Amino acid sequence: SDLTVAVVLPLTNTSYPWSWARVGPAVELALARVKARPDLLPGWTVRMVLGSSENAAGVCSDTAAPLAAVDLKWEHSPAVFLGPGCVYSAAPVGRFTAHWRVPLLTAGAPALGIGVKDEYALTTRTGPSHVKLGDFVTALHRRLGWEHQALVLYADRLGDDRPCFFIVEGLYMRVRERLNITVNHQEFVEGDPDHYPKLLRAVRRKGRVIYICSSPDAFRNLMLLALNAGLTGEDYVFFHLDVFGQSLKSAQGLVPQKPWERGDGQDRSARQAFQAAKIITYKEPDNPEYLEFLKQLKLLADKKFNFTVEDGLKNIIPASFHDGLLLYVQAVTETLAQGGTVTDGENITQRMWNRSFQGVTGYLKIDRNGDRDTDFSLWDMDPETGAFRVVLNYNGTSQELMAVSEHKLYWPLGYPPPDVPKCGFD
Amino acid sequence: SDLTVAVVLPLTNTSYPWSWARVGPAVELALARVKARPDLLPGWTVRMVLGSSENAAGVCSDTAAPLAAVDLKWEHSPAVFLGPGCVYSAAPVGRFTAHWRVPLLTAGAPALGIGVKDEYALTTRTGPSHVKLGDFVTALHRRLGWEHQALVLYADRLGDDRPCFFIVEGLYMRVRERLNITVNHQEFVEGDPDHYPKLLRAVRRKGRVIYICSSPDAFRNLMLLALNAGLTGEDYVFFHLDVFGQSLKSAQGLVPQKPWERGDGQDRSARQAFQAAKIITYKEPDNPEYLEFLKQLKLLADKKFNFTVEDGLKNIIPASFHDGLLLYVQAVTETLAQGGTVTDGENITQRMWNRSFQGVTGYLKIDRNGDRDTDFSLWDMDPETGAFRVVLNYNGTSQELMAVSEHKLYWPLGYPPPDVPKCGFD
Amino acid sequence: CFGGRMDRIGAQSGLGCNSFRY
Ligand SMILES: *[C@@H]1O[C@H](CO)[C@@H](O[C@@H]2O[C@H](CO)[C@@H](O[C@H]3O[C@H](CO)[C@@H](O)[C@H](O[C@H]4O[C@H](CO)[C@@H](O)[C@H](O)[C@@H]4O)[C@@H]3O)[C@H](O)[C@H]2NC(C)=O)[C@H](O)[C@H]1NC(C)=O
Ligand SMILES: *[C@@H]1O[C@H](CO)[C@@H](O[C@@H]2O[C@H](CO)[C@@H](O[C@H]3O[C@H](CO)[C@@H](O)[C@H](O[C@H]4O[C@H](CO)[C@@H](O)[C@H](O)[C@@H]4O)[C@@H]3O)[C@H](O)[C@H]2NC(C)=O)[C@H](O)[C@H]1NC(C)=O
Ligand SMILES: *[C@@H]1O[C@H](CO)[C@@H](O[C@@H]2O[C@H](CO)[C@@H](O[C@H]3O[C@H](CO)[C@@H](O)[C@H](O)[C@@H]3O)[C@H](O)[C@H]2NC(C)=O)[C@H](O)[C@H]1NC(C)=O
Ligand SMILES: *[C@@H]1O[C@H](CO)[C@@H](O[C@@H]2O[C@H](CO)[C@@H](O[C@H]3O[C@H](CO)[C@@H](O)[C@H](O)[C@@H]3O)[C@H](O)[C@H]2NC(C)=O)[C@H](O)[C@H]1NC(C)=O
Ligand SMILES: [Cl-]
Ligand SMILES: [Cl-]
Numbered sequence: 001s002d003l004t005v006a007v008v009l010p011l012t013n014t015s016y017p018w019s020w021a022r023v024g025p026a027v028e029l030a031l032a033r034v035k036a037r038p039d040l041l042p043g044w045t046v047r048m049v050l051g052s053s054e055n056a057a058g059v060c061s062d063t064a065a066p067l068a069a070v071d072l073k074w075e076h077s078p079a080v081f082l083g084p085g086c087v088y089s090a091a092p093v094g095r096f097t098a099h100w101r102v103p104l105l106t107a108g109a110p111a112l113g114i115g116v117k118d119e120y121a122l123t124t125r126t127g128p129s130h131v132k133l134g135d136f137v138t139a140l141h142r143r144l145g146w147e148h149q150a151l152v153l154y155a156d157r158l159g160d161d162r163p164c165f166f167i168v169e170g171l172y173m174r175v176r177e178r179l180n181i182t183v184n185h186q187e188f189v190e191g192d193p194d195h196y197p198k199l200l201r202a203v204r205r206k207g208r209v210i211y212i213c214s215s216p217d218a219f220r221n222l223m224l225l226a227l228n229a230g231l232t233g234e235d236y237v238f239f240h241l242d243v244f245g246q247s248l249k250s251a252q253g254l255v256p257q258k259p260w261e262r263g264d265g266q267d268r269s270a271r272q273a274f275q276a277a278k279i280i281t282y283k284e285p286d287n288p289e290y291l292e293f294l295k296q297l298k299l300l301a302d303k304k305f306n307f308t309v310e311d312g313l314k315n316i317i318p319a320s321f322h323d324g325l326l327l328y329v330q331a332v333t334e335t336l337a338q339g340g341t342v343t344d345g346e347n348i349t350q351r352m353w354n355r356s357f358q359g360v361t362g363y364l365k366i367d368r369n370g371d372r373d374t375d376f377s378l379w380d381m382d383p384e385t386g387a388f389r390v391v392l393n394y395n396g397t398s399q400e401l402m403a404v405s406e407h408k409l410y411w412p413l414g415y416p417p418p419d420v421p422k423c424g425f426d
Numbered sequence: 427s428d429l430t431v432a433v434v435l436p437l438t439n440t441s442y443p444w445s446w447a448r449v450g451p452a453v454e455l456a457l458a459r460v461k462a463r464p465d466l467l468p469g470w471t472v473r474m475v476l477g478s479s480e481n482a483a484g485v486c487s488d489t490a491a492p493l494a495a496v497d498l499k500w501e502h503s504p505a506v507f508l509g510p511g512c513v514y515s516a517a518p519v520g521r522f523t524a525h526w527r528v529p530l531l532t533a534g535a536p537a538l539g540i541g542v543k544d545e546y547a548l549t550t551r552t553g554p555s556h557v558k559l560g561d562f563v564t565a566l567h568r569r570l571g572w573e574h575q576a577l578v579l580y581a582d583r584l585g586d587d588r589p590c591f592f593i594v595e596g597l598y599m600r601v602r603e604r605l606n607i608t609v610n611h612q613e614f615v616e617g618d619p620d621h622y623p624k625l626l627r628a629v630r631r632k633g634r635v636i637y638i639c640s641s642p643d644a645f646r647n648l649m650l651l652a653l654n655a656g657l658t659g660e661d662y663v664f665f666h667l668d669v670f671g672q673s674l675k676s677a678q679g680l681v682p683q684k685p686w687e688r689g690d691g692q693d694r695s696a697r698q699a700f701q702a703a704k705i706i707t708y709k710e711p712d713n714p715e716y717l718e719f720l721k722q723l724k725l726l727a728d729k730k731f732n733f734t735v736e737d738g739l740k741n742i743i744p745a746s747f748h749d750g751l752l753l754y755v756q757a758v759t760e761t762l763a764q765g766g767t768v769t770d771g772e773n774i775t776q777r778m779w780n781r782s783f784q785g786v787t788g789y790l791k792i793d794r795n796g797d798r799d800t801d802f803s804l805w806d807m808d809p810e811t812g813a814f815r816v817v818l819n820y821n822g823t824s825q826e827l828m829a830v831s832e833h834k835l836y837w838p839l840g841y842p843p844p845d846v847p848k849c850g851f852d
Numbered sequence: 853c854f855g856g857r858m859d860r861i862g863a864q865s866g867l868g869c870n871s872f873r874y
Contacts, residue, residue: 062859063521070496091861092518095489113861162856169865173874187868488860517858539858588863595854611853613871621872 002045003332003342005325006078008068008093009085010060011052014307017244017317018085018108020050021307025300026318027082029293030325040329041336049076053084053093060161065089069096079342080105080328082321086161087111094120103345105328107320107372111166112173117370122345124352125371126324126364127317128243128282130167132374134174136280136394137211140378141179143401146419149182150175151207153199153222154241155190155214164213167241171211181419190218200225203236209419211239211280216247216259219277220270223260227273233412235421238277243313248379248388250311251284256387257379271386275412282313283375283393285361293319293360316361320372323359327352327366356397365397373397380410428471429758429768431751432504434494434519435511436486437478440733443670443743444511444534446476447733451726452744453508455719456751466755467762475502479510479519486587491515495522505768506531506754508747512587513537520546529771531754533746537592538599543796548771550778550796552750553743554669554708556593558800560600562706562820563637566804567605569827572845576601577633578611579625579648580667581640590639593667597637607845616644626651629662635845637665637706642673642685649699650692659702659838661847669739671707674805674814676737682813683805697812701838708739709801709819711787719745719786742787746798749785753778753792782823791823799823806836 007020007027014021027048034040051068055061065084072078073096081097084090085108094114097104098121107127114120115131141147152172154164165187172183184206188195203210203226212219219240226236240247247259259279260270294315301309309315331351332342340347354368365373373396380391391407394400409416433446433453440447453474460466477494481487491510498504499522507523510516511534520540523530524547533553540546541557567573578598580590591613598609610632614621629636629652638645645666652662666673673685685705686696720741727733735741757777758768766773780794791799799822806817817833820826835842853869856862865874 062518062857063525066492066518067496067522067525070493087861088857088859091859092488092492096493099489099493111861111864113864116864162862165856165862165867169867172867173865185867513858514860537858538855591863598854611870613866613869613873615873618872624872 001043002047003041003080004076004078005046005048005080005082006051006069006072006076007048007082008051008053008065008072008089009083010054011050013054013058013060016060016085017314018083018106018321021305022297022301022309022315023083023318023321025303025305025309026293026297026322027325028300028304029296030322033326034329039333040326041333046329049078053086053089059159060084060086060089062088062092066092066096069093073100073102078102079332082106082325084108085317087114087166088161090114094123098122101343101345103328103349105321105324107317107324110170112170115369115371122349123370124324124328124349124366126327126366127320127372128374129371130170131174132170132371132396133167133241133243133280133376134171134178135374135396135399136376137171137175138178139394139399139401141175141181141209141419144416146209146416147179147181148420149184149207150209150211150419151202152183152185153188153202153210153212153214154185155188155218157190164241167213167243168211171241190215196221196225200229204229204231205425207419208236208417208421209239210236211241213241216240216242219247220260220262220274223273223277224266224270226276227269231276233276233410233417235417236276237417240277240279242279243282245279245281245313247279248281252311256385257389258387260386274381274386275383275410277381278409279379279388281377281379282316283377284313285316285319287360287362289360290319290362293322319359319361320364323357323361323364326359327355327357363397377404378409380407383410427469428473429467429506430502430504431472431474431506431508432477432495432498432502433474433508434477434479434491434498434515435509436480436484437476439480439484439486442486442511443740444509444532444747447727447731448723448735448741449509449744449747450731451723451729451735452719452748453751454726454730455722456748459752460755465759466752467759472755475504479512479515486510486512486515488514488518492518492522495519499526499528504528505758508532508751509534511535511743513540513592514587516540520549524548527769527771529754529775531747531750533743533750536596538596541795541797548775550750550754550775550792552753552790552792552798553746554800555797556596557600558596558797558822559593559667559669559706559802560597560604561822561825562800562802563597563601564604565820565825565827567601567607567635567845570842572635572842573605573607574846575608575610575633576635576637576845577629578609579614579628579636579638579640580611581614581616581644583616590667593639593669597667616641622648622651626655630655630657631851633845634662634843634847635665636662637667639667642666642668645673645703646686646688646696649686649703650696652702653695653699657702659836659843661843662702663843664703666703666705668705669708671705671739673705674707677710678737682811683815684813686812700807700812701809701836703807704835705805705814707803707805708742709803710739711742711745713786713788715786716745716788719748745785745787746790749783749787749790752785753781753783789823803830804835806833809836
């Protein structure tokens with residue numbers, strides 16, 4: 001007569017894209033819409049029981065989360081788990097739920113290994129995956145002739161959830177799975193100056209198509225050094241892997257978009273350097289339902305969560321929890337419609353898998369593997385104004401690259417430089 | 427009035443050095459001695475509750491074990507955990523017990539990361555650690571003039587507990603922490619023939635002091651290829667990291683010791699190759715108490731466990747659980763002796779740490795970090811007979827290398843070859 | 853390559869390491 005939804009997310013830390021202060025009101029919106037829909041679980045009163053994935057220091061934990069999962073499992077015997085979003089929180093919890101035969105929904109956990117659904121059974125991902133990034137990069141190389149070599153520079157802060165590592169893992173494995181070109185990789189520590197000579201050396205020794213996963217400031221500094229060292233767009237192209245657009249303002253206002261601007265008198269030098277740089281991000285959902293969803297999310301978060309949700313790509317994570325939750329409720333309603341129960345985790349999961357759906361994020365497709373296809377945008381600078389704007393969009397489900405607003409991809413040489421230099425790298 | 431001991435080990439799989447078929451009767455011996463000692467917990471009736479760390483497939487699990495730990499924790503509220511031995515099992519469980527404020531004892535979990543007692547609080551290790559292997563290698567290099575460069579080849583079967591990786595990780599980190607020489611490392615897959623051209627090429631390109639962590643057959647084949655490729659003891663030295671002496675028979679009978687013998691007509695060629703090869707192992711305990719312990723362990727395992735315990739280095743693991751358990755009981759008795767309780771996990775742990783003890787394994791020393799110092803033996807072949815015998819022994823507590831039975835380290839050139847070649851590696 | 857946690861989730865590609873597999 002009622003559905004128990006277990007939640008394991010950061011209930012107190014509001015810094016994560018999947019923090020409760022932001023995923024909570026998105027979920028509450030989803031529940032409220034289930035009530036307003038006589039076609040979604042009519043009569044059921046979906047209850048939620050919460051559990052914090054964060055430890056005593058307030059960061060998502062490989063221990064607090066699995067502990068929270070067992071506690072909710074024996075106290076409330078829920079039908080579905082929501083979250084976690086962090087990789088090292090999600091991996092133990094996912095393995096628990098998999099053993100429990102309980103479905104797991106999350107718009108986080110984008111790591112490669114979560115993709116092994118043979119292990120993370122009944123885990124459905126309705127937000128981004130890092131293999132999907134490899135899909136985009138594959139299509140990008142195929143459409144630009146880079147079929148030999150790329151170099152990937154990544155860095156993480158010690159003790160975090162290693163987001164860049166997992167981003168690069170997914171890109172690396174998927175790209176070599178599909179193209180089998182040489183993908184060199186190097187890890188650095190942003191705060192350590194010893195690495196910058198090394199990186200610059202590796203840049204001009206290991207690749208000309210270069211992907212950097214780092215903070216905005218790290219990527220800016222690396223660009224300034226590459227200009228200082230004479231590395232221009234005629235030979236090098238630097239892709240910042242900034243999937244959440246930390247180096248950009250929101251798509252709602254703040255016209256125009258200038259990541260090289262910093263106010264330290266280096267801005268004139270950074271704009272010249274950034275002529276060789278392009279930013280890879282997730283795609284902002286276009287559909288008006290998204291914008292209406294942002295308005296309600298903001299209203300409900302400031303109301304019942306004392307939190308101020310600001311505009312940005314991070315809002316697709318709570319948008320995807322919202323969508324995935326509705327996607328589940330329909331699946332349950334469908335399973336009930338054929339004599340099943342809310343505990344037929346396999347029947348329910350397979351109903352959600354290999355399926356297209358219409359949510360606040362617009363068209364979303366769950367693949368055969370249980371993972372949402374992920375669309376990506378490519379930002380480039382206008383050589384006239386210097387501001388960055390989307391010039392290329394990737395539809396994850398169709399794996400097509402569509403030019404945006406009739407823009408062209410800026411090249412100092414009129415066409416992309418080759419991924420291998422003249423007479424070798426020497 | 428009674429002490430509850432929680433155990434999380436492989437209760438059904440008898441393949442692990444820390445399997446219950448082998449650690450069970452050793453623990454049984456340890457409890458029986460507690461009963462016979464009026465100075466160890468007089469009146470207490472130490473009870474044991476078991477949990478299997480292995481999954482449905484029967485191998486130690488990163489999921490079954492932490493689930494077992496929570497089950498024992500809420501069902502019996504124990505005062506100490508015993509095991510797990512596998513790294514990926516022990517890591518989640520250790521973090522759980524650390525959060526619970528419950529001491530954890532194990533003769534396994536040798537991985538570098540378990541050593542971070544700031545995280546794995548109240549985890550005391552009474553068996554080997556892989557950093558301790560780094561200590562041995564450090565002393566070895568210091569005593570032989572290799573102060574520049576080594577090469578480390580390692581391989582693991584997919585999906586196992588990655589024992590070679592963790593062995594190499596510990597060796598790698600500790601050695602560079604103390605010597606700061608260049609330690610090159612390469613992973614391979616034993617069954618993949620493509621890797622053998624690569625390894626051989628890397629052997630003669632990346633080092634002359636070479637350590638290999640692999641199966642005996644893998645190490646044999648690599649030696650045959652090295653001899654076939656003209657790599658002799660005058661330039662190269664190959665250390666097999668075989669800590670459990672899988673490539674050797676037991677120290678009890680089976681005289682003499684021939685790892686290159688295989689019965690495939692290649693044995694004549696393998697003996698010549700193995701003249702450049704030395705085997706690093708744990709040290710067999712000398713004390714007569716150890717041998718009397720082996721006799722009782724065999725009798726009790728065949729009796730109440732239907733298991734046949736064969737001679738070998740693996741038996742130090744149950745010996746160490748046995749000793750570790752007695753070391754705890756005394757600590758608890760000491761804590762009780764000063765008004766403490768059995769739940770003063772920090773007081774009990776600190777009584778065990780930085781302490782020397784006498785167990786069936788003889789002298790054992792828990793360092794300031796909660797880790798047993800680990801002694802290593804070095805095996806070398808007699809150029810006359812070809813059989814391998816211990817020629818060097820390493821006392822982990824005093825970090826001294828002592829020649830064994832007046833033997834010398836065999837060198838084709840009279841002295842060890844330099845860890846760097848003539849005019850560079852080119 | 854070494855020192856990064858003890859979860860199999862962090863051992864799906866190496867990516868810091870020098871491996872012939874993956
Ligand atoms: C990224 O690529 C995806 C793969 O190509 C796109 O998916 C396509 O999305 C469209 C709609 O967004 C979808 O169209 C049809 O879907 C229904 C199922 O086949 C079909 O019944 C619909 O038809 C009905 O409605 C139309 C009016 O809309 C009527 O004219 C018809 O007579 C009928 O009554 C609808 O036409 C495609 O099926 C779908 N393709 C796949 C392969 O799933 C994504 O939309 C695209 N996303 C973006 C943002 O570009
Ligand atoms: C590896 O190196 C370790 C560090 O050097 C060795 O530890 C040493 O072990 C010995 C005994 O095995 C130990 O000796 C003394 O220990 C007691 C504590 O100080 C001390 O009270 C003892 O003295 C008594 O007994 C003797 C007879 O044995 C009498 O003559 C004395 O008058 C007294 O009554 C005992 O002598 C060392 O203290 C200890 N050193 C350290 C630094 O811990 C390991 O034994 C060694 N292992 C192997 C296998 O080589
Ligand atoms: C909310 O989560 C934030 C990110 O998860 C977190 O920020 C980070 O806080 C940690 C402390 O937990 C900082 O780092 C340190 O971690 C260990 C633990 O002490 C230290 O040993 C390390 O040396 C390191 O200094 C991170 O640097 C910091 N990162 C950022 C981007 O802020 C917040 O602190 C959390 N806030 C609350 C209220 O829980
Ligand atoms: C007792 O434990 C043994 C080692 O822990 C175990 O041996 C190993 O068994 C596994 C199967 O679990 C073999 O491997 C495979 O693992 C996955 C799971 O199916 C496969 O996808 C892989 O491709 C791979 O084939 C190991 O090869 C094998 N190793 C050895 C040295 O034997 C025993 O099977 C366990 N026995 C019992 C009764 O539980
Ligand atoms: Cl989380
Ligand atoms: Cl175990």
